[PDB]
Amino acid sequence: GLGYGSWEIDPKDLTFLKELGTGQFGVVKYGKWRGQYDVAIKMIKEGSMSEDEFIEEAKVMMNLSHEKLVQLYGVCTKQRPIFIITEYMANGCLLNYLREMRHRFQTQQLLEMCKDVCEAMEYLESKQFLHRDLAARNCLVNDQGVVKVSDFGLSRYVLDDEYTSSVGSKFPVRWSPPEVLMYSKFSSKSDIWAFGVLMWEIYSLGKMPYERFTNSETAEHIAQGLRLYRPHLASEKVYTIMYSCWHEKADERPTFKILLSNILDVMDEES
Numbered sequence: 162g163l164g165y166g167s168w169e170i171d172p173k174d175l176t177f178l179k180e181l182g183t184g185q186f187g188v189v190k191y192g193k194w195r196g197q198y199d200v201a202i203k204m205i206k207e208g209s210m211s212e213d214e215f216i217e218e219a220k221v222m223m224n225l226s227h228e229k230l231v232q233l234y235g236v237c238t239k240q241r242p243i244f245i246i247t248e249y250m251a252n253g254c255l256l257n258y259l260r261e262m263r264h265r266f267q268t269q270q271l272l273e274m275c276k277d278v279c280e281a282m283e284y285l286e287s288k289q290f291l292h293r294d295l296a297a298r299n300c301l302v303n304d305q306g307v308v309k310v311s312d313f314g315l316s317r318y319v320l321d322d323e324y325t326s327s328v329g330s331k332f333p334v335r336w337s338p339p340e341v342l343m344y345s346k347f348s349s350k351s352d353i354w355a356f357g358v359l360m361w362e363i364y365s366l367g368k369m370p371y372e373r374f375t376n377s378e379t380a381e382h383i384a385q386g387l388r389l390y391r392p393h394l395a396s397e398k399v400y401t402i403m404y405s406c407w408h409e410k411a412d413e414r415p416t417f418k419i420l421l422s423n424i425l426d427v428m429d430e431e432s
């Protein structure tokens with residue numbers, strides 16, 4: 162209504178029900194929109210984000226729509242802190258979910274999680290939209306066990322330089338290809354690399370990648386052409402798929418479309 166752009170939600174329409182946690186942007190809450198609809202509400206800590214650039218990009222993000230992509234509903238601006246309003250993912254972040262051993266996952270379920278994410282990434286790829294920080298910690302799980310990709314693109318607007326470049330102590334070294342670590346060369350192929358690392362995370366039930374190394378050591382390992390190896394729960398066909406994301410040469414890495422086809426083939430073959 163009056164005073165609100167299409168990308169703009171009225172905060173007054175929100176009822177907060179439960180606190181969900183605190184990240185580097187701060188607090189995230191579960192609540193309702195206009196009394197009925199489940200939403201998540203992420204509150205951006207003052208001073209943490211390039212807010213104007215983000216708000217403008219929010220307009221683009223609103224047009225992104227896929228069943229395996231966390232749906233942005235809108236943003237609450239001209240209040241501090243600003244809110245990001247999205248669909249609510251009841252079972253939380255993929256990473257913690259994988260580490261909960263009680264689930265006793267079948268490898269079928271793990272392959273499906275991979276397929277969930279790969280569908281989202283094929284969609285983003287089809288819209289020439291890079292994630293830039295794909296990892297288990299950023300994927301979410303809904304009440305039906307479906308995995309969706311979240312925080313897509315968001316790292317572009319983080320002001321904390323510990324997060325922003327390779328020479329930073331909070332950069333995702335472990336999810337980065339050699340050309341990112343060496344030259345900061347981002348592309349669809351650095352999203353691919355990170356996806357194979359995510360398949361590894363999934364098949365490893367949430368182990369941190371290169372868990373015995375520091376980031377610095379990991380970068381050296383990668384630069385020398387050494388790689389993550391096969392998780393116990395991954396078949397040879399699945400390992401082949403994740404390993405193919407890590408070709409030293411970016412143009413030799415597959416697309417998300419080819420990855421999806423590979424994953425469907427393995428699914429049919431191991432069904």
Ligand SMILES: *CCC(=O)Nc1cccc(Oc2ccnc(N)c2-c2ccc(Oc3ccccc3)cc2)c1
Nearest residue numbers: 181182189201203247248250254256298311312313
């Ligand atoms: C595994 C790490 C972890 O604990 N993450 C975590 C913890 C608490 C709350 C979190 O965010 C949630 C939780 C549940 N549902 C949703 N939707 C979210 C959430 C909400 C908003 C955003 O922001 C963006 C989403 C999509 C695109 C850009 C921004 C992200 C997650 C997560």
